[PDB]
Design a protein around this ligand. Structure first.
Ligand SMILES: OC[C@H]1O[C@@H](O[C@H]2[C@H](O)[C@@H](O)[C@H](O)O[C@@H]2CO)[C@H](O)[C@@H](O)[C@H]1O
Ligand SMILES: OC[C@H]1O[C@@H](O[C@H]2[C@H](O)[C@@H](O)[C@H](O)O[C@@H]2CO)[C@H](O)[C@@H](O)[C@H]1O
Ligand SMILES: OC[C@H]1O[C@@H](O[C@H]2[C@H](O)[C@@H](O)[C@H](O)O[C@@H]2CO)[C@H](O)[C@@H](O)[C@H]1O
Ligand SMILES: OC[C@H]1O[C@@H](O[C@H]2[C@H](O)[C@@H](O)[C@H](O)O[C@@H]2CO)[C@H](O)[C@@H](O)[C@H]1O
Lengths: 150, 150, 150, 150
């Protein structure tokens, strides 16, 4: 299923993003001078199941969760440098049931254990001076598709 | 290469669309009540190498070519009914040197012999009440990529 | 990388099967009357990092690990029924650093935590009356490849 | 549909290779010192609809056709050099209805007009000292599948 997720907006998923589900986020540009760019996986109740904060100017990507009206939990971080590949940087999120797998263009995957057991109903995109394009292409799968030889 | 082609606009390609090149056009929605939607493959000199005019009312897809300041030549048209598949309708164009191959969601491929011997420098998208999303996700290849077993 | 893994034989990998690596195993046939078929991911020192024992009669798929000259540890098994899809049954293994993820044609993914902290140097295939073809087509990736929209 | 086409043998297609059909041939090796290697697309009547003769020692690839007990027609040739890419060279054949498209690893595609109007029922592989592996992996499609971004 294809979606065009615009900045400072979101897309309501046709089906719940649940275990086995794959979200392929791809940008049609890379604005090297952009600022903090955020991507949230929200539940039907608007809880933030997976928060990804891409901070170029702090050289770190922060992962967290929080309930609609709750506080943030502990931050899980990683170096921002050499993760994205211009001109079409991408982010791939896979629900492995007990945790999420987030793969960027470079480096090994980041594993985030689930903190709020609920499936995702929507994907949000927030940033004032986005690091990526608007919209970004999002192809959500019900499961891993057949893979090409390369 | 990923491009986001907004309606009544166009996208300047990073490299010429030439023989062996494949353009994968995908929309995140299908507006049944949509009007006439047009996709053009333009050359550097703005010649319309391949004109794809989708007409729901008139029930046909019309293919043509035309120089920037010239007149349209004969039309090669086909039935519009049962070509697209909602919610993510698609259009794929492949350059085979002497002719273009066009493929939709349903039916067989359509072949259109080249009339203006030039490569494409940009892809246009026009519509008053587009049949598709805005923008449309467009993936351009230099050659046919590795195929999945399914 | 494409390998043809013949039965009761193995294939020496061009590069270590490590975290982020994906192995796409596919058979060109399914022999219903097949017996116990085994696939092993072996380390340079011939340790059996991941043992996949498919048992049609006993109706289960058994996962285990073992040092070259050591004894098997506890078995992590699952029901065999409705896992494969003829005529081209498949098995996919992905290394996630701390555990392996196994996927068949049907059902959800299976996760097996690593027991022997070593990378795989070869992939073995054993069977008296194999359930699959000989050889089996095997595509190994360094990282997850680009995914088709479907 | 997957097939394992062994040298000096063939594979009977589950379905007729006809217009829109794609055959993806991939070798798991490249024997640079190998000799002439042949791949034939045969009809149910054993007519050779598409003959591909890969001649390294003559630096040419020859295309031809002929009926089960008929003579060869005129040869359509091309340079052999820099077409295949080790260690996993490939050949892709696509039926465009009025002609075939043959793409190797490098160079533009070769277009062969059909000479015997019949669909293919089998694919043969002949060579004394093959340039490729045995078997070769063959994934035949009923039509072009969804393409990955790269
Ligand atoms: O935890 C995610 C959350 O972080 C906020 O920023 C934190 C910052 O990381 C921390 O070092 C500082 O002490 O407190 C800030 C506020 O909690 C972001 O503002 C917010 O957008 C999320 O990304
Ligand atoms: O042929 C492409 C061109 O068609 C124009 O419409 C045609 C119409 O299809 C034809 O039946 C009539 O005879 O002439 C019209 C004008 O030449 C479209 O208006 C134009 O945008 C192109 O799509
Ligand atoms: O556990 C992997 C190992 O199993 C052996 O068979 C086991 C059998 O599954 C178990 O029920 C019994 O208690 O012990 C047997 C031998 O330890 C297989 O023979 C061996 O090949 C591996 O597959
Ligand atoms: O035409 C395909 C056919 O060619 C045969 O070889 C030809 C050769 O190409 C030509 O130059 C010579 O004059 O005659 C030979 C016999 O026709 C191959 O022997 C045969 O296998 C096919 O590849």
């Amino acid at each position: 299923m294809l979606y065009h997720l615009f900045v400072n907006n979101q897309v309501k998923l046709q089906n719940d993003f649940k275990p086995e589900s794959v979200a392929a986020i791809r940008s049609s540009a890379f604005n090297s001078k952009g600022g903090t760019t955020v991507f949230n996986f929200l539940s039907a109740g608007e809880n933030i199941l997976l928060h990804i904060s891409i901070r170029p100017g702090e050289n770190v990507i922060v992962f967290n969760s929080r309930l609609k009206n709750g506080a943030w939990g502990p931050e899980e971080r990683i170096p921002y440098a050499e993760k994205f590949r211009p001109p079409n940087p991408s982010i791939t999120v896979i629900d492995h049931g007990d945790r999420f797998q987030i793969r960027f263009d470079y480096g090994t995957s980041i594993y985030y254990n689930k903190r709020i057991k609920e499936n995702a109903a929507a994907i949000a995109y927030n940033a004032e001076n986005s690091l990526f394009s608007s919209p970004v292409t999002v192809d959500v799968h019900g499961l891993l598709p057949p893979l090409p030889p390369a």
